[PDB]
Amino acid sequence: SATRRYYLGAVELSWDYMQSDSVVYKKTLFVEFTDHLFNIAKPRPPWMGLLGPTIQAEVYDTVVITLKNMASHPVSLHAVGVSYWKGAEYDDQTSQREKEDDKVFPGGSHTYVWQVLKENGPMASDPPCLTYSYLSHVDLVKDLNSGLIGALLVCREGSLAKEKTQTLHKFILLFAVFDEGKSWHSETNNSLTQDRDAASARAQPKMHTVNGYVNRSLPGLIGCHRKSVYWHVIGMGTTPEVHSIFLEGHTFLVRNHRQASLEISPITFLTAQTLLMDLGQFLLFCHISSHQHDGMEAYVKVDSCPEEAKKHPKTWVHYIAAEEEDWDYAPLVLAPDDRSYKSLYLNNGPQRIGRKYKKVRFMAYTDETFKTREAIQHESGILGPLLYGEVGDTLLIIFKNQASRPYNIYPHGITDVRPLHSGRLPKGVKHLKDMPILPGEIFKYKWTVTVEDGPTKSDPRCLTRYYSSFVNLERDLASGLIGPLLICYKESVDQRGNQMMSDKRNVILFSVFDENRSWYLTENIQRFLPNPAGVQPEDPEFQASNIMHSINGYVFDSLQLSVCLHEVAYWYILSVGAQTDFLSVFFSGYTFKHKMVYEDTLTLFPFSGETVFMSMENPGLWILGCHNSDFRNRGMTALLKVSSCDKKTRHYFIAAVERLWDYGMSSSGSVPQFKKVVFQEFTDGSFTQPLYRGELNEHLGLLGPYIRAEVEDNIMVTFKNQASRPYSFYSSLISYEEDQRQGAEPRKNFVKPNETKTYFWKVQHHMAPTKDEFDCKAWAYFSDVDLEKDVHSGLIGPLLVCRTNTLNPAHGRQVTVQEFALFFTIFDETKSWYFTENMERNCRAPCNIQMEDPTFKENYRFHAINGYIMDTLPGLVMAQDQRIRWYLLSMGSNENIHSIHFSGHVFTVRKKEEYKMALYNLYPGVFETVEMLPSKVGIWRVECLIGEHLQAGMSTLFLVYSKKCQTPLGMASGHIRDFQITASGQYGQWAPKLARLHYSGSINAWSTKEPFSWIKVDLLAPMIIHGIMTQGARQKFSSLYISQFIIMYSLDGKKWQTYRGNSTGTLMVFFGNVDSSGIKHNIFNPPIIARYIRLHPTHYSIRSTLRMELMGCDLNSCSMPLGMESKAISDAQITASSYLTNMFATWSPSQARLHLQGRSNAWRPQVNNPKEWLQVDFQKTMKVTGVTTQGVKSLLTSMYVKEFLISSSQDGHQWTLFLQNGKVKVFQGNQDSFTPVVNALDPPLLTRYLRIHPQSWAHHIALRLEVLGCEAQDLY
């Protein structure tokens, strides 16, 4: 274990972005220093720029970061991906010492210790170094937008030394979107802002930047020739805004996958690897057009450095020509609907052109003179002839510009384009991509595929690329110059062109052809419109009619993809259009194999493309489209008509009961109660009595019941709508085999109010997790009547499909792993099905009801986790050292990208191989199952780090408790005072005060006479109650067994919850022994967390007499034993002043084990004096909650220390006698030799050594002690 010590410091510096180091924007950044004196800063490479110093560590390493705060605003240091103990200021219930790390005030410092453990180490199938980051978590939004961020690297064991020899040449890239408006250092005009507008200063424009440098001013990026340079990418977006980072002529490698671009969602860490096999000053630019206008571009100045079954290249002769054609977007559609949105698109008027437009389409030809067209199918539509090619293949693209405008041909994946025989390119034309081929010219191209652009072994068989004209980046695509390119792997495409066993080669283009930018715009205006003078350039309606959201160039289900049944086929999806945001492309009830993982949502970034692989077996007609509500409404749909290519019943009952749901504002002027519809499980088919939700299912919240089923476990879900609107039940897994009866009619569910419908399907392998995945895979079910509105209303629930023999048969769920499903989304109640009723009931006059007002929409917007806003989601309890399987999922609009983070925790993602991650980025429709191992006990916060998403409140608290803190809570010991105990009634003799365990006389618990007599005990603070003792009891010759009570608990004394736990019934019957004496100590599994417990006896054997004792530990679960009876500490650590070690009866300190008998059963010093001690070592700074001294009975004589002391020391020399308020606290040791006496330290002592001084004893000093406490940080 090598300790690596850094000295960080947050300093305010006048950053200047563009100008290598625009306007001088004040920024606060982490700056490393040489020593703790904080005088000299370590030199920084120029390419780092506005980025915190890199912190590197290996497995089993430890870092001691001393963070000073020289700024004028509070700063913390919250590392990600490493283990540490209590830098986040949230509710965790910890003392002042453990809250200092959460926030650091200016002029102060704190020594964080992010010890790296084996769980943080990369797996075998992972890159040698993993990319993480650290930041300031005081405010998140303002901190990130103020530049406070660094980098963190967790490499393999000893891998730093090897990296020194074979330098992997790692680059640290920060794709920051720093916005000066929402930063810690935003314009100070807010002070005395009257008559001095803050918007005059350009409204603090956001700066799309790379490492703090904008518009190609990165002065340090220098690669090496033939060098596999590694990249470490960190995204910094407070707002949910994406980026697409491209490298000129270079393709990245992430997870052994050929990423043509970097999908940089707001907060993302990834490790890339680009094999630099070329010289020149390349460009690292953002390709999405709205960000292409921005300045997120950089220089990659690669330089030379000193040195230390087709299988042949085949030519591809093609004759592509640009032809002017009148394209009909929706030719086979019916009349436009009244004056709806369809009439905006497919209708003709003074401001509307209609469905026909003048464009240019890439047309194939069978000759070099371009005088004979080929056969173009209706499926392709606007797409040109298909282009392909294995690695190392030449593509003779003979291109003729038959159209009246200069157009050319150029691929996007292939980086080697040769102009056939060496010819002189005209002046000003450096490459073949910007060649303006004049009309009639037949200039040719040759595309040689290289390994650097071909698919890898881990990648799918073919790659989804495209070819298009590049004379103008926007208008050429807007005019219909698009075509597919298939860079396939070797031994998969023959010399003819068709793929080896090309069953159904289907290409779909989810792209938007903005007809406002078509080259033939004025021609369309003066041809297809009656009076061209009526056209206004700035008319929003005229512009709106131009835009045509189309699939393959078809709008409003004009494209009918006739796919065969029982047939295996591929789908190369291409989102290359005017869209500036990702598309949640989905197939109706069709999971597709993507990244070696089955899923029913493919996220495609602009100018990208991902191939998928699905086997068609579900009959019936389906609607392929995008999850985006608006895009599907504008016409981004297609009929995936799949007809027959003619050559353990786990029953569930779900109802959409419309219940008044609040977002937890009651616990977080009246509480705004919103009416929402939610799935709900019901016991019987009449939907009268529902399944009550126990403590283990309390975390579900707004979600529906767990629809759990194993492989080949045919689910049967009966759904009856208890609502006002006709909702439905539909999950992506439902195999509608009943659609085979007729074949073509669209599926209808539309379950009317007070109507019932049955869904029955068999779970198949493709929806089950694979061998390399976890035990249970997550899905979702919702309503397909209106996906967006139904989800916004609250109809959503997880459908877990697990592997064989994973769910426990008795409980119906996997018990060995604590399953936990989460759902992140934004809930704008202005867009709910019940919005009118909710708004009337929640906001009455003088409310200013304005659906267009942004602040009004904010109030109805709720960034919630499972329906709860401010860390309110209850029911998150996990046992330490126990496997957990979180099912993270999210669904919604395009602003629904979240960065799930478990504070002080990391999780493995067995997606394709066993990968390791610490910040998962979820996309709408993506249902990913992860597994985590809880290390430290306490309260940690699950949160999304996406700026205002967390600021508005998207976060929750989960509790990790130790299953070893079962200490008595103080009932019988007298720690629980009598005034805290109250009851309602009593017996003739027994009283509520006299309820202590093993009390004097016949009194041993509480007893009562009148029925329905509850008794409650106020613990004055929430505690994890692990159970209540139940042994034999009696009184006045009345032998009585357990009284069969039911427990109610509450955190405030009002919200009384009945406990069921593992019980399927609404309550758990706490029975036990039967005569008078059997020991049936009740167990709370899962434990009860409440400030108030209450006992309600139901059975009345004799009168009510029982036997009880509260057993539980506190919130921090620090009552666990450090280990004395378990021999956790070695004999060498236990030293004594003297001992009476003998032959038969050794009296050495090594025999001080708790509850050990025999001749050698305890420790007895040679001299019985008050100055003796029993110093024990921990080898680590350990928190000591208390000391439980005990006596012993050596043969016949009974000896015990009646009173002892404590003397702590961090090294064994600085002994400190324990003192309570200045007077030595001499704990009461023992009263007999057979019963331990607990003596809690107040406050608990963190120390490496402590001494037990036996001030008083009986006969000979005897000490069978046992220390209590939990592990803590060292004092580095």
From Swiss-Prot:
Changing residue 753 to L: In HEMA; uncertain significance; decreases binding with VWF and phospholipid; no effect on reaction with F9, F2 and F10; decreases specific activity by 30%; patient develops inhibitor alloantibodies. Changing residue 961 to C: In HEMA; moderate. Changing residue 12 to V: In HEMA; mild. Residues 2-305, 314-645, 648-965 form the F5/8 type A domain. This is Coagulation factor VIII. Changing residue 970 to V: In HEMA; severe sporadic. Changing residue 833 to L: In HEMA; mild. Changing residue 242 to G: In HEMA; mild. Changing residue 241 to K: In HEMA; moderate. It is linked to Hemophilia A: A disorder of blood coagulation characterized by a permanent tendency to hemorrhage. About 50% of patients have severe hemophilia resulting in frequent spontaneous bleeding into joints, muscles and internal organs. Less severe forms are characterized by bleeding after trauma or surgery. Thrombophilia 13, X-linked, due to factor VIII defect: An X-linked dominant, hemostatic disorder associated with markedly elevated F8 levels, and characterized by severe thrombophilia. Changing residue 122 to S: In HEMA; severe. Factor VIII, along with calcium and phospholipid, acts as a cofactor for F9/factor IXa when it converts F10/factor X to the activated form, factor Xa. Changing residue 559 to V: In HEMA; mild. The gene is F8. Changing residue 527 to C: In HEMA; mild/moderate; secretion impaired. Changing residue 1103 to L: In HEMA; mild. Changing residue 1248 to G: In HEMA; moderate. Changing residue 1094 to H: In HEMA; severe/mild; affinity for VWF reduced 3-fold. Changing residue 650 to G: In HEMA; mild. Changing residue 941 to W: In HEMA; severe/moderate/mild. Residues 965-1113, 1118-1270 form the F5/8 type C domain. Changing residue 1045 to L: In HEMA; mild.
